[PDB]
RNA sequence: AAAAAAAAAAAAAAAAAAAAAAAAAAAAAAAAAAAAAAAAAA
RNA sequence: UUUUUUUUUUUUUUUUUUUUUUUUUUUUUUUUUUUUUUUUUU
């Protein structure tokens, strides 16, 4: 495989392509040929080696595998101990994850129904099951995808990673272990093999993605694996989590030693204006921690990797150097993984309450109940008054808003989400009997698995426990309207997300402190709530609501501090609720297991997965920091601040002024976060913003490529649906575009992800018909015969896809390689910037040689070519509806990862009246006879993400008749709208004059694709910038619809909108309320109905993922100056911007073959005839 | 006068694809009741 | 034979996967007719 006609050419031809298809067939299907392919006895085992650093400095690394992985210690059950009473694991057990040991040393010698037997059963579950995490298929097919891509890329197997695969995973003539989705277990064959290797499969996969991606060279892979195997001496993850923090904080060393390095000057609006040369030297108070990190990286690290870090300090010249060595040192200490074990194993050191620093003191309680509870309470000092001197100013404004809402509706609506539900609300919620079942309701512990960090405990949803805390959220969320402090904002996905981070990194006199606060769950004690409780109460005293069920506004007896007797004062409903909510607070997350029964936690554990909890932590943090600004302003010291953003786990703070007025204020904010009880590490620098999966230094973007996990699902549940899987893959590759230093490797790697991983598709055919479907399908397709089983109604027969399916318009939508026409002229290689959608239908025409299509003046496709490569078969498999459907509720989850989880937290309980409004809307449509599919309605949604989160293909006669129908002669069907794709571009001899920001981004690259003279940088020089305007438009669409859905006639939204329009036009208002249609959305649809009825279905449709173009322009006006259109086309056609869309999508489509020359436009005459008969705004309903 | 072939246009019955909606079939999941087997105190 | 666990047989309600049947909805298309023109023979 390392050779081929392909791997030495990289094009697709008659020979090369079909060889790739036929060969990946056996690298996928066969469970033998994979054992050869990986484990072949002809490879040179590497002893020493000489590679390069990621920047080209030549290192020399050696492959050393420890014996403890080769000959593991036997199982010594002092690793996981128990308490004497065996109520729960012993405190301070060093191992919260799997310890290495022999696979067959752990067995059950014990009778059922004991605590030991359930230990060995639960750990026996832990290594065999919880170590099974994979996306597409068997983990060995994943190693074959990565490793195959490595071979084809480097045209050899000389490289080290394969020798790790051979030394580690080949101990015998078979695979040491495999995984069966029937049992959902990793079944060991060799019982002398180590226990933790099935994770090192996924680890070798991730490292391989680092090599193909371009981050880690081969030597860097050797140091990576050496580090891993060294951390696997005792416990893999357990000994990583010590390192992962310290292994990366260095670059501030490197950035300190770089001295003067240039940088692009950002602007607030997301332009790039100048480029300045600034000193990167860290100030004194930052340079003092350098000694501590020096001493600390010695005592803890693997020696070779430590020497590689010191090497990354000494030998880094410019800033780009620090970025590269940081992507390396980040890929070495960290993997695409999901850290997981038995929840009760990691429960303590994660969610168990932690108390340190200084305690918190009570506010003096001025107003009380007859129960001696708290009504009004106010602080002596310090921290309470520090927060209240800020937060307590919003109460005046928040009273007006909380009074306006009708809070009986604020609950009813939420019950109807997740009439006759009112009578449910009352029977139930009108009695004070409700708060009994509330107070006595246990709280389930729901853990969520994180990529690079430990299991995160999340507080769960409905009902009653949230029903206690609903009101103080109804008051508490109002501050989001009144502040820039917290960020709940819309996620665009573009660089517009990061724009202001870049802005403040490029300003002068800046001190950037990004605090990692993530311990807010177990670091918030019981008294640390009162900082928020005084706020919510002091708002509720102003708030007047007559009833929030079951609370009546009524005269209640109160005791003040200065008054001995009881007094009569009118007490509202929200004031009573907020009196009990603080007056009764019990947070115990009790995980019920099979081992220990029902475990429990003490209180002061307040995990933030919800609107209540997140809006608690954000209000606390705001009050603390801004109130501290007011405190410094009250002591006369000038308060230095610019912006403060509370992200999900991270606080942003930005300063100006001298080092004393910045610094002293920074230390003051740190000291007041410590006096509130939180022990956090503030990260202070002239230039950096650390956060998570966003690293912003000097106005560049270093963003983390490891946080994306290519090979591992979080749910571990395999899904045999091919379309959905390839959507996962395409979306991840869209996430890694600007996070990967060389994202050509993503295209090969992802390609063999498509070929090797997702290929075979099992389907049962009713036994009266077997060889018939095998005939019709096996003409084009390639199947696997079976023997009809002993009297089953339907017997399984698999289907291995034609490899050409990955490139097809409705099939896999992927950045295709260049094919070969009959002219010997290859097509254009796609650069990762391409349109997934009806635009991919052009390839059928590129293979037909569109230039002759225009020279012959004909409409046609070659089924000779396309049949020879296998496009016709793939289009059978697409047209036969054989594959597995996808909703838009699944596309509601796109799976890019978000900067701030805060949005995902608040939108659980957010927008109740809206989702209820669209609910009653769509239900009214359903009552009137025209219904809507559950994908389209803005109401519902999130429900299978919420309501059904808490709960527990056959070939029939019809399919046979359809197959018989289409499979005699397929003859790929030509939709007349395809005339739009018959344009093609001549290459002129002039040159394009680049935009000014080319030179600004020419020195220190923005992201890892922006390096000088590279696809990202050059395409950026040609187009390269966002529209803040247009992005604000699509955001104005976003939070309303919940997402930005770029319109097209193929969307079921438009379809079921047109059914209504055509049939009953009086329901369009109800329909628009059901889909949450904003004003311009309504306008666009009402234009698309007229255009769609007049002209039929006519559009030129494409999809550019907002993550796919992170810095690049979505607006296709930037291609005007790039191409030229001969005046012939100006004469006849009245249309313009469509041609700018062709030129746009094409220029993004190549940028590799593009050396900077300008292009022309050649239009097929049938294209002109097709355009001049259809209005421009019909093809493009948006503009 | 004739009819037919060929070119193209207009109209017309019918299979199919897909959203929603109804009935049946199958198979699996969760609970219950009636015949029997082993049993721990009597 | 009174107190407790499982299993098999039979029965019910509900749930899900797929199949089949029926309709409205929205498009693709054998076949028939009429019309503008060329061709042929008595």
């Amino acid at each position: 495989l390392h050779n081929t006609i392909f791997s030495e050419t990289r094009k697709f031809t008659r020979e090369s392509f079909k060889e790739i298809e036929h060969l990946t067939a056996r690298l996928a299907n066969d469970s033998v040929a994979r054992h050869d392919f990986l484990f072949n006895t002809s490879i040179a085992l590497i002893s020493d080696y000489s590679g390069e650093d990621s920047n080209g400095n030549q290192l020399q690394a050696t492959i050393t595998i420890p014996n403890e992985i080769i000959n593991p210690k036997e199982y010594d059950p002092s690793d996981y101990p128990l308490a004497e009473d065996e109520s729960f694991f012993k405190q301070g057990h060093k191992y919260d994850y799997l310890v290495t040991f022999r696979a067959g040393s752990l067995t059950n010698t014990y009778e059922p129904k004991t605590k030991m037997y359930k230990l060995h059963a639960a750990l026996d579950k832990l290594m065999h099951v919880r170590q099974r995490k994979s996306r597409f298929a068997d983990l060995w097919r994943e190693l074959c995808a990565v490793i195959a891509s490595l071979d084809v890329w480097y045209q050899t197997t000389n490289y080290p990673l394969r020798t790790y695969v051979k030394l580690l995973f080949h101990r015998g003539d078979e695979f040491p272990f495999y995984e069966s989705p029937s049992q959902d277990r990793i079944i060991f064959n060799d019982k002398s093999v180590a226990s933790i290797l099935p994770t090192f499969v996924y680890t070798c996969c991730q490292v391989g993605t680092a090599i193909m991606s371009g981050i880690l060279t081969h030597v860097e892979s050797i140091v990576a694996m050496n580090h891993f195997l060294h951390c696997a001496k005792d416990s893999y993850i357990d000994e990583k989590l010590k390192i992962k923090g310290i292994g990366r904080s260095w670059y501030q060393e490197a950035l300190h030693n770089v001295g003067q390095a240039t940088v692009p000057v950002w602007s607030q609006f997301n332009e790039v204006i100048g480029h300045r040369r600034k000193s990167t030297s860290e100030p004194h108070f930052v340079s003092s921690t350098f000694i501590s990190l020096r001493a600390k990286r010695a005592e803890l690290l693997y020696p070779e990797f430590n020497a590689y870090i010191n090497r990354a300090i000494q030998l880094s010249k410019t800033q780009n150097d620090v970025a590269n060595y940081y992507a390396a040192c980040r890929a070495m200490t960290n993997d695409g993984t999901f850290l997981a074990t038995l929840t009760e194993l990691s429960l303590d050191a994660a969610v168990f309450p932690r108390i340190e620093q200084r305690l918190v003191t009570r506010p003096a309680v001025l107003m009380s109940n007859t129960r001696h509870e708290s009504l009004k309470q106010k602080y002596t000092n310090g921290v309470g008054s520090i927060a209240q001197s800020y937060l307590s100013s919003f109460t005046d404004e928040i009273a007006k808003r909380v009074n306006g809402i009708h809070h009986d509706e604020a609950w009813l609506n939420f019950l109807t989400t997740s009439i006759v539900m009112q009578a449910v609300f009352a029977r139930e919620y009108r009695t004070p009997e409700r708060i009994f079942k509330s107070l006595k309701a246990p709280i389930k512990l729901v853990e969520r698995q994180q990529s690079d960090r430990r299991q995160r405990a999340i507080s769960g949803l409905d009902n009653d426990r949230l029903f206690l805390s609903f009101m103080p959220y109804t008051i508490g969320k109002q501050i989001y309207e009144l502040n820039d402090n917290a960020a709940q904002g819309k996620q665009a996905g573009n660089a517009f997300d990061i724009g202001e981070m870049l802005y403040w990194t490029s300003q002068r006199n800046v001190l950037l402190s990004s605090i990692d606060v993530a311990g807010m769950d177990a670091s918030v004690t019981t008294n640390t709530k009162d900082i928020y409780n005084t706020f919510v109460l002091d708002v509720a005293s102003k708030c007047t609501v007559p009833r929030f069920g079951p609370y009546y506004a009524k005269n209640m007896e109160v005791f003040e501090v200065g008054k001995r007797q009881s007094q009569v004062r009118y007490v509202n409903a929200a004031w009573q609720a907020c009196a009990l909510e603080a007056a009764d607070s019990q947070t115990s997350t009790s995980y019920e297991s099979e081992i220990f029964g029902q475990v429990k936690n003490a209180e002061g554990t307040y995990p933030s997965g919800r609107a209540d909890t997140s809006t608690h932590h954000t209000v606390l943090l705001q009050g603390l920091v801004r109130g501290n600004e007011l405190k410094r302003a009250s002591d006369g010291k000038n308060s230095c601040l610019a912006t403060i953003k509370i992200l999900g786990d991270d606080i942003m703070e930005i300063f100006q002024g001298s080092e004393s007025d910045t610094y002293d204020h920074a230390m003051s904010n740190a000291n007041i976060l410590n006096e509130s009880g939180f022990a956090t590490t503030a990260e202070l620098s002239q230039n950096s913003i650390v956060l998570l999966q966003q690293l912003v230094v000097n106005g560049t973007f270093w963003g983390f490529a490891d946080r994306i996990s290519l090979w591992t699902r979080e749910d571990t549940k395999d899904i045999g649906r091919l379309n959905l899987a390839m959507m996962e893959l395409n979306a991840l590759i869209d996430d890694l575009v600007f996070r990967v230093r060389r994202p050509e490797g993503l295209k090969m790697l992802g390609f063999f992800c498509g070929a090797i991983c997702l290929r075979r598709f099992t389907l049962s055919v009713d036994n009266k018909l077997y060889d018939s479907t095998y005939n019709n399908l096996s003409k084009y397709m390639t199947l696997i015969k079976y023997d009809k089983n002993p009297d089953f109604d339907s017997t399984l027969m698999s289907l291995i896809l034609p490899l050409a399916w990955l490139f097809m318009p409705r099939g896999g939508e992927y950045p295709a390689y260049p094919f070969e026409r009959r002219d010997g002229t290859f097509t254009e290689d796609e650069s990762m910037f391409t349109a997934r959608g009806a635009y991919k239908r052009r390839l059928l025409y590129d293979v037909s040689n569109i230039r002759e299509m225009i020279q012959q003046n004909s409409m046609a496709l070659d089924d000779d070519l396309l049949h020879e490569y296998g496009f016709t078969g793939a289009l059978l498999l697409i047209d036969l509806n054989i594959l597995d459907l996808i909703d838009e509720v699944k596309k509601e989850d796109i799976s890019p990862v978000k900067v701030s989880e805060l949005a995902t937290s608040l939108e659980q309980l957010g927008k109740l009246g809206e989702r209820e409004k669209s609910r009653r809307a769509a239900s009214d449509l359903k009552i009137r006879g025209h219904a809507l599919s559950n994908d389209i309605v803005y109401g519902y949604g999130l429900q299978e993400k919420i309501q059904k989160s808490a709960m527990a293909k056959r070939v029939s006669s019809r399919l046979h008749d359809v197959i018989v129908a289409k499979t005699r002669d397929y003859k790929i069907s030509t939709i007349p709208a395809d005339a739009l794709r018959l344009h093609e571009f001549e290459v002129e001899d002039v040159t394009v004059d680049l935009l000014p920001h080319a030179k600004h981004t020419s020195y220190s690259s923005l992201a890892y694709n922006m390096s000088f003279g590279s696809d990202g940088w050059f395409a950026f020089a040609l187009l390269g910038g966002l529209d803040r305007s247009a992005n604000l438009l699509r955001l104005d669409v976003a939070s309303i619809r919940g997402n930005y859905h770029k319109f097209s006639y193929d969307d079921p939204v438009f379809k079921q909108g047109y059914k209504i329009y055509k049939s009953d036009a009086t329901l369009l208002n109800d329909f628009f309320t059901a889909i949450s249609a904003g004003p311009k959305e309504q306008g666009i649809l009402l234009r698309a109905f007229a255009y769609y009825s007049l002209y039929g279905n006519v559009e030129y449709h494409y999809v550019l993922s907002p993550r796919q173009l992170f810095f690049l322009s979505d607006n296709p006006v930037s291609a005007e100056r790039l191409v030229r259109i001969p005046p012939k086309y100006y004469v006849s056609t009245q249309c313009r911007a469509l041609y700018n869309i062709f030129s746009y999508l094409h220029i993004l489509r190549s940028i590799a073959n593009n050396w900077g020359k300008r292009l022309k436009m050649v239009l097929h005459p049938g294209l002109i005839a097709y355009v001049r008969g259809t209005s421009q705004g019909a093809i493009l309903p948006e503009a």
Side-chain angles (χ1 to χ4, degrees), chain A residues 820-888:
Chain A
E820 183 182 3
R821 299 175 177 87
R822 289 186 179 277
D823 292 345
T825 60
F826 298 97
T827 59
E828 296 176 351
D829 185 3
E830 293 177 348
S831 64
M832 287 294 184
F833 302 154
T834 52
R836 292 181 176 86
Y839 178 75
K840 299 300 287 187
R841 191 174 180 82
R842 179 182 178 175
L843 292 175
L844 301 176
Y845 293 88
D846 279 345
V847 177
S848 68
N849 199 30
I850 295 171
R851 57 178 58 85
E852 288 182 351
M853 294 296 294
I854 296 170
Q855 291 175 336
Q856 294 177 337
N857 295 335
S858 65
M859 304 295 293
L861 293 173
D862 287 344
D863 290 342
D864 297 345
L865 286 167
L866 300 176
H867 175 61
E868 191 281 337
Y869 296 99
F871 292 95
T872 61
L875 290 175
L876 279 171
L877 185 140
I878 291 169
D879 290 346
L880 294 176
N881 292 337
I882 293 173
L883 294 175
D884 295 343
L885 297 174
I886 297 171
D887 287 345
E888 288 183 349

Side-chain angles (χ1 to χ4, degrees), chain A residues 248-249 251-252 255 282 285-286 326 453 498 500-502 504-505 510-519 621 625 641 643-655 662 665-667 669-670 673 679-698 704 899:
Chain A
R248 58 183 69 86
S249 63
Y251 61 91
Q252 293 174 335
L255 291 174
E282 297 301 321
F285 57 88
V286 178
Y326 181 81
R453 287 185 176 175
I498 296 173
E500 291 182 352
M501 303 297 181
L502 301 172
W504 291 103
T505 54
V510 175
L511 174 62
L512 294 170
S513 65
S514 64
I515 298 168
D516 290 344
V517 79
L621 298 174
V625 178
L641 285 174
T643 60
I644 295 167
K645 293 178 178 178
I646 294 98
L647 297 174
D649 288 343
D650 293 338
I651 298 170
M652 288 299 296
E653 294 176 350
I654 297 168
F655 301 91
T662 55
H665 187 188
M667 296 301 294
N669 285 336
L673 289 175
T680 60
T681 60
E683 291 171 346
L684 297 172
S685 65
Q686 179 178 355
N687 54 346
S688 64
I689 294 172
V690 175
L691 299 179
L692 292 175
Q693 72 177 18
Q694 176 181 352
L695 179 61
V696 178
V697 175
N698 288 337
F704 301 156
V899 172

